[PDB]
RNA sequence: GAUGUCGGCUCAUCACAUCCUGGGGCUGAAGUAGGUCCCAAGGGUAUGGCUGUUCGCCAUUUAAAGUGGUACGCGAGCUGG
RNA sequence: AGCCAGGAUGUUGGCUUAGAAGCAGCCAUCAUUUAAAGAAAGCGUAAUAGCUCACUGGUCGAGUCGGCCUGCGCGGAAGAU
């Protein structure tokens, strides 16, 4: 989990999702691409 | 790093930075990076942004810098009281008003100029926009 | 099932063919002499490609293919090794009569319908190795 | 991406080859490698047969200009056409052996004389010999 | 052929022109010839999309001012300092 | 919306009972009941179920699509049913069923006994296989997630409880 | 027309940017042991050698020897280096 | 959008290297069978294999894609009684 002000898609398998008012990046291919805006 | 080679005077009044820019069109190249905001660009900021756009285009095409840091900025060091003369010149700034075309480019496709200008914009303290040359 | 490129009358050394096909389960003395017995008609100093077909009982059957396109362009131009930087450095020259000679030999493996279709397929192998058409 | 200029041109090229050819074969080719296909393209050009895969929408358009306007109901699923421009037959025999030897696909329907041939009755254009047999 | 619909301006000056732009419209002028210059107002979106084509600045355009048709050529343009907007256009009678 | 507009065909033998927002779907494989969101207007009529938004509800179409999806898998549940298959990977990792309890040996000091809920039944065809069956798609998914949770697949050998249809990507350990 | 200064002693009280213990994501996480970030303030969080020292260096501990605010907390509570 | 099927041939392109066969690097990047298939976007092998994408045929059946001008919100957002 990477927590930062600037959360982006890092590859084609990255997906932007808003869960409970928090922008997150969830990736099906790379665990290092998992992000939470904060 | 840009700087006047010589000046009539060393120091300058603070002044103000009201108004809209002169030199709002893409005059030399095909694309431009335009100021949307108001502020001061330092010589170091201008050099950082010039480096970013130049690396991006793999030193292909041509680049123009429409801005020049000709305004000297003084500063008083730590543990120095007020007065006892105007401070010493530390760096140089260009005064920026909304609308100035800061940089121009040609000899590269639009997609590459947009990316090179995106990278350069991230080094600047003021909001910018991507502009293209127009017929009049 | 493996693909290799062995010499016309040479098949036995360890570094090129040895543990490359032997690791799967192929007889090293049975194939080496059955290959050279059929490639005896093929000229000296020409690498000939062969495809191996192996089954569950360690048995094997092979089909001999025509020499490679990047192989025949070297003997036609009079070169041992190609260019390190193709189209940037010229290493030889081959005529239009030499292009049709390689194409008529490669006809058994080529996908082309006409002679002009097979000749253009050899023209592409020549450009990508530094050899200019003259 | 296929433009309408491209679509019109493909209808034009298949409408021209429709007029000239004598026997046309419509079949399926889903689940067959390119190695076996480039092998049926070499066996096709040799027998004077024109081989193509065309969008079924584009076929219903090339076939509307007569006499294959009965092959319409075979333009459902992957469609591969075999237009024999030189000597009637060739394809209907070439496809039957390719179908049996590879087990994949089924072969939809055949066309000749401007009449529809069902999937079971393709033994009519499979038993026909040479031109070149009457002597 | 570019056809621009315009109305004559009922006002003039700084106040009136800023009010036009706040209403998604913009002032423009038509001059040249023996005729008196004609101060007009244009729809911003309509003329903005038109001028995106290079032909707008080369071709003879037609301005429709209260039924009447005026053959013109784009003479000068004042663009917004940083936004993709038009502030004013000069048309010369062709 | 595209999901909501697609009608659910209720087959012969399936009974549908609607009491406002409460829907009871009875079949050969059991009975399931759900309370649909107020934004969902459900219509019976013929051998089908149709779903639409209710006037004055801002999320009607998003709700009607969920309600559709749910009722479709309720119908499948009480007829065909659902099947979740799990497989145990690792030395000594074994499973067994004793009525409604799954006994799991998963490298712990104490063996794990997992109590199955109402409507879910399990059978072990092998010592390294768990087959779950039930009418509720949500409850079977929950039980399969709960069993997998005891030892989730590890990234170095693929060891643990995995779903049969699960892709377990492995990796090499840090070099030196 | 006076708001006593550094450090110590005694006694503390709050914050959390968390030192330990607790939960967790990523790891260039095999295990053991770590790195980094997120959550978490419930409690816990050395004694000595030198120096007025706070600090620091050093010795030996400890799960750990947190970082800060409180008139750089605390002399009508003590000390007075 | 999803799902079915293909993703070929010269060829293991040339150079280099113990090996480099689309997939360490460097240079070139055409041509053929074509519905379409980069002398190859990423993972994998000691090198091969193997998995998938760009692209295309089928199925489905009416919408779908992301830039511009704007209103109001969201994260970024930790402190001491
Ligand atoms: Mg939550
Ligand atoms: Mg005023
Ligand atoms: Mg007093
Ligand atoms: Mg915290
Ligand atoms: Mg950090
Ligand atoms: Mg505490
Ligand atoms: Mg320690
Ligand atoms: Mg104090
Ligand atoms: Mg006292
Ligand atoms: Mg599609
Ligand atoms: Zn990703």
């Amino acid at each position: 989990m990477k927590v930062r002000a600037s959360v982006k898609k890092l590859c084609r398998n990255c997906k932007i999702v808003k869960r409970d008012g928090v922008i997150r990046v969830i990736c099906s291919a790379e665990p290092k691409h998992k992000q939470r805006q904060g | 790093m840009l700087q006047p080679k010589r000046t009539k005077f060393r120091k300058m009044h603070k002044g103000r930075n009201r108004g809209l820019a002169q030199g709002t069109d893409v005059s030399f190249g095909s694309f431009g990076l335009k100021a949307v905001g108001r502020g001061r660009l330092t010589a170091r900021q201008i050099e950082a942004a010039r480096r970013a756009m130049t690396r991006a285009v793999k030193r292909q095409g041509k680049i123009w810098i429409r801005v020049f840091p000709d305004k000297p900025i003084t500063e008083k060091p730590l543990a120095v009281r007020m007065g006892k003369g105007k401070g010493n010149v530390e760096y140089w700034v260009a005064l920026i008003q909304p609308g100035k075309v800061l940089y121009e480019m040609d000899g590269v496709p639009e997609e590459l100029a947009r990316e090179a200008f995106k990278l350069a914009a991230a080094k600047l303290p003021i909001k910018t926009t991507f502009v293209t040359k127009t017929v009049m | 099932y493996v693909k290799l490129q062995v010499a016309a009358g040479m098949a036995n050394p360890s570094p090129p063919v040895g543990p490359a096909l032997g690791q799967q389960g192929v007889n090293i003395m049975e194939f080496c002499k059955a290959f050279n017995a059929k490639t005896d008609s093929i000229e000296k100093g020409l690498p000939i490609p062969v495809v191996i077909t192996v089954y569950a009982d360690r048995s094997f059957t092979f089909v001999t293919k025509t020499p490679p396109a990047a192989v025949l362009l070297k003997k036609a131009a009079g070169i041992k090794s190609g260019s390190g930087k193709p189209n940037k450095d010229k290493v030889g020259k081959i005529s239009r009569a030499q292009l049709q000679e390689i194409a008529q030999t490669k006809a058994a493996d080529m996908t082309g319908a006409d002679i002009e279709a097979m000749t253009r397929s050899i023209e592409g192998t020549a450009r990508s190795m530094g050899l200019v058409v003259e | 991406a296929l433009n309408l200029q491209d679509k019109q041109a493909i209808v034009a090229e298949v409408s021209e080859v429709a007029k000239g050819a004598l026997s046309a074969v419509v079949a399926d080719s889903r689940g067959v490698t390119v190695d076996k296909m480039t092998e049926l393209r070499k066996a096709g050009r040799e027998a004077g047969v024109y081989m193509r895969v065309v969008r079924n929408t584009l076929l219903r358009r090339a076939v509307e200009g007569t006499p294959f306007e009965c092959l319409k109901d075979a333009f459902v699923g992957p469609t591969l056409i075999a237009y024999v421009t030189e000597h009637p037959g060739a394809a209907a025999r070439l496809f039957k052996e390719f179908a049996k030897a590879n087990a994949k696909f089924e072969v939809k329907a055949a066309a000749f004389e401007g009449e529809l041939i069902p999937a079971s009755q393709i033994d009519r254009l499979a038993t026909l010999p040479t031109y070149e047999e009457a002597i | 052929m570019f056809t621009i619909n315009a109305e004559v301006r009922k006002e003039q000056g700084k106040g009136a022109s800023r009010r036009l732009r706040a209403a998604n419209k913009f002032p423009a002028i038509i001059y040249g010839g023996k005729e008196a210059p004609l101060a007009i107002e244009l729809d911003h979106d309509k003329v903005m999309n038109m001028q995106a084509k290079a032909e707008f600045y080369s071709e003879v355009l037609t301005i429709v001012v209260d039924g009447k048709e005026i053959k013109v050529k784009a003479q000068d343009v004042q663009r917004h300092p940083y936004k993709p907007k038009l502030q004013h256009i000069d048309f010369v009678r062709a | 919306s595209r999901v909501a507009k697609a009608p659910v065909v209720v087959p012969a033998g399936v009974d549908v009972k609607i009491n406002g927002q409460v829907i009871t779907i009875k079949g050969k494989n059991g009975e399931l009941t759900r309370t649909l969101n107020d934004a969902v207007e459900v219509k019976h009529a013929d051998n089908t179920l149709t779903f639409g938004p209710r006037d004055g509800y801002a999320d009607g179409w998003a709700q009607a699509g969920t309600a559709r999806a749910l009722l479709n898998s309720m119908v499948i549940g009480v007829t065909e049913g659902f099947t979740k298959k799990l497989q145990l990977v690792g030395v000594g990792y074994r499973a067994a069923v004793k009525g409604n309890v799954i006994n799991l040996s998963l490298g712990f000091s104490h063996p794990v006994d997992h109590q199955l809920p109402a409507g879910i039944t399990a059978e072990c065809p092998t010592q390294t296989e768990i087959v779950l069956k039930g009418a509720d798609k949500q409850v079977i998914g929950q039980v399969a997630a709960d069993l997998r949770a005891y030892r989730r697949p590890e990234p170095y050998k693929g060891k643990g409880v995995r779903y049969a249809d699960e892709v377990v990507r492995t990796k090499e350990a840090k070099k030196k």
Side-chain angles (χ1 to χ4, degrees):
Chain A
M1 180 78 63
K2 176 130 212 160
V3 188
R4 55 191 299 166
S6 178
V7 299
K8 290 170 173 169
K9 279 173 75 262
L10 303 179
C11 85
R12 63 156 289 111
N13 298 82
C14 277
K15 189 172 197 75
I16 305 272
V17 67
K18 196 168 148 175
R19 281 174 186 169
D20 197 17
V22 184
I23 301 314
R24 298 164 181 275
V25 182
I26 282 280
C27 188
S28 60
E30 187 53 56
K32 281 176 175 190
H33 290 187
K34 180 158 82 201
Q35 293 157 88
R36 179 178 102 239
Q37 196 169 46
Chain B
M1 198 161 93
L2 297 170
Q3 206 175 119
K5 294 175 204 296
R6 70 151 302 282
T7 60
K8 204 152 66 176
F9 303 100
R10 271 159 85 228
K11 301 178 186 182
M12 208 182 265
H13 279 168
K14 191 187 311 300
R16 299 298 183 265
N17 188 31
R18 284 197 37 193
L20 299 164
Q22 299 303 323
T24 58
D25 299 298
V26 176
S27 298
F28 302 90
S30 292
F31 318 102
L33 188 53
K34 177 177 265 196
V36 161
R38 185 178 300 290
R40 293 187 169 180
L41 289 188
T42 68
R44 287 188 185 259
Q45 275 158 13
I46 301 165
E47 180 62 24
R50 192 210 53 82
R51 282 182 205 177
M53 61 175 74
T54 308
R55 252 293 296 177
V57 299
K58 281 100 182 93
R59 317 197 113 78
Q60 286 167 69
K62 198 173 176 69
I63 292 167
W64 290 261
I65 306 177
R66 302 268 313 276
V67 291
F68 196 91
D70 65 345
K71 178 179 176 66
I73 304 302
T74 72
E75 256 145 50
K76 275 183 135 54
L78 276 185
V80 150
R81 303 174 292 211
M82 302 280 100
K84 330 280 184 190
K86 174 158 185 99
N88 305 321
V89 183
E90 304 294 9
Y91 61 101
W92 301 77
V93 304
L95 291 184
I96 309 301
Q97 299 86 27
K100 251 257 198 289
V101 170
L102 311 176
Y103 298 94
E104 281 179 29
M105 202 180 268
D106 76 7
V108 302
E110 191 173 306
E111 200 190 281
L112 187 66
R114 288 188 105 107
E115 244 302 281
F117 283 163
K118 208 196 180 178
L119 290 169
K123 309 305 178 180
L124 306 181
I126 61 127
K127 280 191 197 66
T128 60
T129 195
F130 183 89
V131 293
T132 304
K133 149 203 84 176
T134 70
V135 191
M136 94 172 70
Chain C
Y1 310 94
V2 283
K3 57 181 90 187
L4 275 102
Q5 287 178 50
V6 216
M10 282 177 80
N12 201 46
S14 188
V17 73
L21 106 155
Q23 63 181 286
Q24 307 294 94
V26 193
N27 302 74
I28 203 90
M29 65 169 281
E30 196 171 45
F31 173 70
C32 278
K33 230 79 192 174
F35 165 80
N36 298 324
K38 281 194 170 185
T39 58
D40 65 328
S41 58
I42 313 298
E43 298 270 54
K44 191 187 171 188
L46 260 154
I48 184 128
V50 66
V51 181
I52 272 294
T53 306
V54 285
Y55 310 98
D57 64 294
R58 284 179 184 174
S59 189
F60 55 91
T61 47
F62 64 94
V63 180
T64 52
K65 286 197 124 164
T66 57
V71 154
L72 287 154
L73 275 156
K74 286 178 183 180
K75 62 168 269 174
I79 52 140
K80 291 169 186 175
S81 61
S83 190
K85 285 175 186 175
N87 290 119
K88 267 183 171 172
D89 176 78
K90 296 174 188 190
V91 284
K93 58 183 177 182
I94 45 104
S95 60
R96 284 165 206 90
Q98 284 198 289
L99 282 148
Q100 282 169 62
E101 275 178 68
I102 304 155
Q104 274 154 61
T105 316
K106 274 244 78 70
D109 295 341
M110 281 277 167
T111 52
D114 291 283
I115 312 143
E116 288 94 64
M118 290 177 180
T119 306
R120 284 180 181 189
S121 290
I122 302 294
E123 273 172 51
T125 317
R127 288 162 189 180
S128 65
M129 73 192 288
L131 296 164
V132 284
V133 284
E134 282 294 297
Chain D
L2 276 192
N3 180 230
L4 187 46
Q5 196 188 285
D6 305 29
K7 287 170 189 198
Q8 281 173 314
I10 299 152
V11 172
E13 281 172 30
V14 178
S15 223
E16 199 184 77
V17 178
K19 294 154 138 181
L22 286 139
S23 73
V25 185
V26 166
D28 190 283
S29 68
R30 197 208 268 158
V32 168
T33 51
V34 189
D35 291 299
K36 287 178 180 188
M37 282 293 282
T38 317
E39 200 74 46
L40 191 68
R41 293 265 159 85
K42 281 180 181 181
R45 291 189 304 271
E46 171 211 302
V49 197
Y50 184 80
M51 280 285 270
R52 254 250 253 268
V53 197
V54 170
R55 282 178 198 174
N56 312 355
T57 57
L58 251 51
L59 267 146
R60 284 178 230 111
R61 292 179 176 272
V63 132
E64 192 67 28
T66 302
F68 316 106
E69 225 195 289
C70 300
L71 284 173
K72 276 175 176 168
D73 306 280
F75 302 137
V76 174
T79 301
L80 169 77
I81 44 156
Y83 271 124
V84 205
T85 44
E86 189 163 53
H87 174 253
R93 305 186 88 166
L94 194 79
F95 269 39
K96 277 208 160 186
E97 278 179 77
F98 194 81
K100 284 160 83 185
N102 297 311
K104 294 118 192 169
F105 68 88
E106 295 134 84
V107 179
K108 286 157 172 192
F112 193 58
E113 308 148 4
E115 280 168 74
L116 48 105
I117 296 120
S120 58
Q121 291 189 300
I122 331 170
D123 295 291
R124 293 172 188 270
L125 285 147
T127 55
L128 284 159
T130 43
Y131 175 77
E132 290 276 71
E133 192 69 66
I135 313 119
Chain E
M1 166 62 83
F2 291 95
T3 305
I4 299 150
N5 281 277
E7 246 117 62
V8 306
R9 288 182 74 200
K10 290 188 177 109
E11 287 177 77
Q12 86 82 42
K14 166 142 71 175
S17 313
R18 299 196 179 182
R19 278 196 292 271
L20 271 183
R21 299 194 198 96
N24 185 251
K25 300 201 113 177
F26 64 95
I29 189 80
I30 303 168
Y31 55 80
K34 64 174 190 277
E35 310 91 326
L38 188 75
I40 58 149
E41 60 177 80
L42 307 172
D43 182 276
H44 186 262
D45 281 295
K46 296 287 177 259
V47 188
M48 196 59 206
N49 290 325
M50 276 189 208
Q51 66 81 68
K53 293 112 169 246
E55 297 93 328
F56 186 86
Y57 310 97
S58 71
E59 289 184 3
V60 178
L61 327 168
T62 49
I63 301 174
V64 186
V65 186
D66 322 326
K68 192 182 277 198
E69 287 191 10
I70 312 165
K71 277 152 92 175
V72 296
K73 267 187 165 179
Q75 184 54 25
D76 218 333
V77 64
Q78 291 177 30
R79 306 180 172 279
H80 187 281
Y82 57 90
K83 293 170 175 185
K85 288 193 175 168
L86 294 172
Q87 296 271 105
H88 183 263
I89 312 186
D90 281 34
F91 299 96
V92 74
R93 283 179 189 100
Chain F
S1 186
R2 235 185 286 250
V3 181
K5 288 181 214 149
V8 170
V9 56
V10 33
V14 179
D15 293 290
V16 193
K17 221 103 183 74
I18 306 159
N19 187 30
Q21 295 312 98
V22 184
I23 294 170
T24 311
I25 289 160
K26 220 187 175 284
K28 57 196 186 192
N29 211 243
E31 187 187 288
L32 298 163
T33 306
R34 213 174 212 290
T35 291
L36 299 188
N37 185 284
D38 293 2
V40 194
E41 208 257 326
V42 59
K43 292 188 205 74
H44 202 321
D46 301 311
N47 254 317
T48 44
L49 296 159
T50 48
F51 316 81
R54 187 155 291 184
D55 315 64
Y57 288 95
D59 64 340
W61 276 119
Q63 293 293 353
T66 301
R68 191 278 172 193
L70 294 164
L71 264 78
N72 171 68
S73 51
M74 269 170 84
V75 160
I76 295 158
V78 307
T79 63
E80 208 171 319
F82 296 97
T83 306
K84 261 285 184 299
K85 297 177 179 191
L86 302 125
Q87 52 184 96
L88 280 70
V89 181
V91 67
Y93 284 21
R94 295 177 238 275
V97 196
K98 290 177 274 173
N100 70 8
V101 181
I102 316 167
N103 188 59
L104 295 117
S105 167
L106 296 162
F108 298 114
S109 293
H110 53 285
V112 168
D113 280 282
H114 184 72
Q115 175 76 212
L116 294 165
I120 306 299
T121 66
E123 283 213 291
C124 291
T126 320
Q127 287 271 276
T128 53
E129 272 179 80
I130 296 165
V131 174
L132 303 161
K133 274 175 170 76
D136 218 304
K137 196 182 184 187
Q138 183 212 278
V139 179
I140 198 178
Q142 194 61 79
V143 183
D146 290 347
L147 291 164
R148 187 184 175 269
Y150 287 123
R151 200 71 91 164
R152 274 188 290 148
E154 139 255 37
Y156 296 107
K157 278 188 127 186
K159 278 173 91 277
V161 183
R162 65 167 85 190
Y163 299 120
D165 70 328
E166 212 193 306
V167 176
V168 181
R169 277 168 304 147
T170 74
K171 67 166 179 188
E172 289 269 355
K174 184 194 186 180
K175 281 159 194 160
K176 309 160 184 187

